[PDB]
Motif scaffolding. Sequence first.
Motif, PDB file in Angstrom:
ATOM      1  N   UNK B  24     -84.575 -21.587  15.089  1.00 38.82           N
ATOM      2  CA  UNK B  24     -85.020 -22.303  16.427  1.00 38.82           C
ATOM      3  C   UNK B  24     -86.228 -21.838  17.028  1.00 38.82           C
ATOM      4  N   UNK B  25     -87.230 -22.935  16.591  1.00 42.23           N
ATOM      5  CA  UNK B  25     -88.616 -22.835  16.989  1.00 42.23           C
ATOM      6  C   UNK B  25     -88.846 -22.935  18.635  1.00 42.23           C
ATOM      7  N   UNK B  26     -87.945 -23.684  19.280  1.00 45.03           N
ATOM      8  CA  UNK B  26     -88.098 -23.884  20.652  1.00 45.03           C
ATOM      9  C   UNK B  26     -87.198 -23.143  21.716  1.00 45.03           C
ATOM     10  N   UNK B  27     -86.987 -21.619  21.360  1.00 44.07           N
ATOM     11  CA  UNK B  27     -85.952 -20.942  21.858  1.00 44.07           C
ATOM     12  C   UNK B  27     -84.433 -21.790  22.167  1.00 44.07           C
ATOM     13  N   UNK B  28     -84.195 -22.677  21.175  1.00 44.34           N
ATOM     14  CA  UNK B  28     -82.888 -23.604  21.525  1.00 44.34           C
ATOM     15  C   UNK B  28     -81.546 -22.751  20.942  1.00 44.34           C
ATOM     16  N   UNK B  29     -80.497 -23.219  21.194  1.00 43.52           N
ATOM     17  CA  UNK B  29     -79.175 -22.608  20.709  1.00 43.52           C
ATOM     18  C   UNK B  29     -79.053 -22.801  19.334  1.00 43.52           C
ATOM     19  N   UNK B  73     -75.743 -29.274  11.761  1.00 43.46           N
ATOM     20  CA  UNK B  73     -74.593 -29.598  13.032  1.00 43.46           C
ATOM     21  C   UNK B  73     -75.084 -29.189  14.500  1.00 43.46           C
ATOM     22  N   UNK B  74     -75.402 -30.195  15.162  1.00 45.25           N
ATOM     23  CA  UNK B  74     -75.895 -30.021  16.504  1.00 45.25           C
ATOM     24  C   UNK B  74     -74.949 -30.414  17.817  1.00 45.25           C
ATOM     25  N   UNK B  75     -73.828 -29.935  17.563  1.00 43.23           N
ATOM     26  CA  UNK B  75     -72.702 -30.335  18.662  1.00 43.23           C
ATOM     27  C   UNK B  75     -72.257 -29.014  19.743  1.00 43.23           C
ATOM     28  N   UNK B  76     -72.547 -27.792  19.180  1.00 37.18           N
ATOM     29  CA  UNK B  76     -72.390 -26.861  20.318  1.00 37.18           C
ATOM     30  C   UNK B  76     -73.854 -26.332  20.364  1.00 37.18           C
ATOM     31  N   UNK B  77     -74.251 -26.735  21.392  1.00 38.76           N
ATOM     32  CA  UNK B  77     -75.854 -26.583  21.741  1.00 38.76           C
ATOM     33  C   UNK B  77     -75.806 -26.870  23.201  1.00 38.76           C
ATOM     34  N   UNK B  78     -77.078 -27.106  23.651  1.00 42.23           N
ATOM     35  CA  UNK B  78     -77.469 -27.299  25.162  1.00 42.23           C
ATOM     36  C   UNK B  78     -77.170 -28.732  25.502  1.00 42.23           C
ATOM     37  N   UNK B  79     -76.485 -29.033  26.467  1.00 49.20           N
ATOM     38  CA  UNK B  79     -75.962 -30.546  26.927  1.00 49.20           C
ATOM     39  C   UNK B  79     -77.194 -31.119  27.344  1.00 49.20           C
ATOM     40  N   UNK B  80     -77.224 -32.476  26.597  1.00 50.69           N
ATOM     41  CA  UNK B  80     -78.345 -33.541  26.819  1.00 50.69           C
ATOM     42  C   UNK B  80     -79.848 -32.798  26.512  1.00 50.69           C
TER      43      UNK B  80
END
Lengths: 214, 413
Positions: B24-29, B73-80
């Motif tokens: 995660x390059x952009x401090x994402x989940x 897989x990008x479904x358990x992540x930050x909403x929108x």
Amino acid sequence: SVFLESDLVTVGLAVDQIVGVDQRSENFSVVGTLKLSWHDPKLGFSPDQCGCTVKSFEDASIRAVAGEINLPLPSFSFYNQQGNRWSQNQVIFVTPDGRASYFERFTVTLQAPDFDFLAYPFDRQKFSIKVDLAVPTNMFIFNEIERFQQVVGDQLGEEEWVVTSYSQEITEVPFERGSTNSRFTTTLLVKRNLEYYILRIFVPLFLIISVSWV
Amino acid sequence: DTRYLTQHTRNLQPGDTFHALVEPIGEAPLPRLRLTDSGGKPLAFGLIDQPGESVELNYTCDQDICELVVHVDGTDGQKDSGEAVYRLLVGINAPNLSSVFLESDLVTVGLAVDQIVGVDQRSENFSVVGTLKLSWHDPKLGFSPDQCGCTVKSFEDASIRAVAGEINLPLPSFSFYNQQGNRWSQNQVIFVTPDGRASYFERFTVTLQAPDFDFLAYPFDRQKFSIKVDLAVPTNMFIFNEIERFQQVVGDQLGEEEWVVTSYSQEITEVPFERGSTNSRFTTTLLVKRNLEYYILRIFVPLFLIISVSWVIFFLKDYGRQLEVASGNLLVFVAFNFTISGDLPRLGYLTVLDRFMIVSFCLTAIVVLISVCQKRLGAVGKQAVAAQIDTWVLVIYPLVYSLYIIWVYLRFF
């Protein structure tokens, strides 16, 4: 799990343009998209033959080559179509699962026999897009409407009318004798832009009758 | 919108390794990584590493040939999550933290307008003739030139859509989104080399919607004529990535005289279709402005003349005759007004010219309202009073004449 085995047509439709609205002939023209989807355990696309999850087909191939096994397909007709339907792509996808998904982007001219001109120019109308099956319900029924995109497009591109509210709803209709087929009635309710009518008809009138007064 | 991703890899040879990593390059989940075959059947798990920020993944080819598809897989992540970025590290033989090892199928779209045949105003559509070229490498359809004493073989419409669909490998379909009616396709010819470089161009005639017609600025109006060309298939299959200008976008000889093109725009977008599926859109937009040389010599020159008459009658002061003339000049105005034809669809708004025209008519009648008054005076007496206002009006009339123009300049520019 559900032990009556099902074949069930899921219809979606969307208008994206109101091209033409004739008044004299009492018809109108829209561009849209129509999506039908249905599980058939048949046409079971084991992905050992294809290095893929999904295979697709267009018009001449589907109606001919899918009719090679002679298993049935859910046909459909725009009931209140006038003239021809200008079909741009008739593409249809299938999963190993056997999930059929047919959508068709189209150009149509449709009849509006519920044009009441009495309220004019303050008149509201019903523009409908009735889409039957050709086959009966011994074979196929649509039961569930999927809104696969918004029914009324942001940019319809018509300026004399604008849509008030839409209606999508299924009915079942007699065909032949004692046979019923589904009808996906997709109805826009419409009201007339009076801004033209006020500025070029009504104020002039007021002015002219004002002269008689003065 | 794009909440899941795949990459079809290159064909791994027997007994060849594979390495994969997400960061995660952009401090994402944290995402789930997986490897799967060309179908659904899966091969591995991208485990969460010792540090606890990298998704390490490993596999080696045991089958006869390995066709591979990396999942992210990008479904358990930050909403929108508007931005979520990831760095996908993928390689075949060296475990490190020349040529490009993600197998590519990539649609190169080119389009060119060569004629603006028709431009409807009422219906708000327009018609163009053009050419559209799509090109893409498929290692497949590999034309070994031992069968053909040649480097290149070609096909037209009924043969390609049917006979190329005989192997049942996929082809990049496409649709002119904002097409109205039918597309008049003259030749749909498609070429392929041994290499497996697909070359599809199609010369066409189209009618297209322009829902971005602003008639307010009329006849001083600029417009957007667009030629939006989507794929029918999603981007699980095909994307246009790079625009090739295979010839100049705007033809020298368009053949239309009411409009001429100012500037063009060609640009790719990605659009939602169905649910949670995106397809490329090659938006090719002409910006246009109206030739007003017609509008100046057949609408504006006359207007100036007619209002000039109302002005010059104030010079005269033979009041009966002055009034007669002014009244006559107003009468012409009516004729002239209904002469000018606007081909505009009946419209909610007043346009520019509608506003100047309505201002012209009414005060032109105000010049007549003044002739009456002056004549009356003159008859009873106070003839100088009538002459005073004559001069008075001449001064004021053409400046309210001018400011009105400058007024609308502002509001309409």
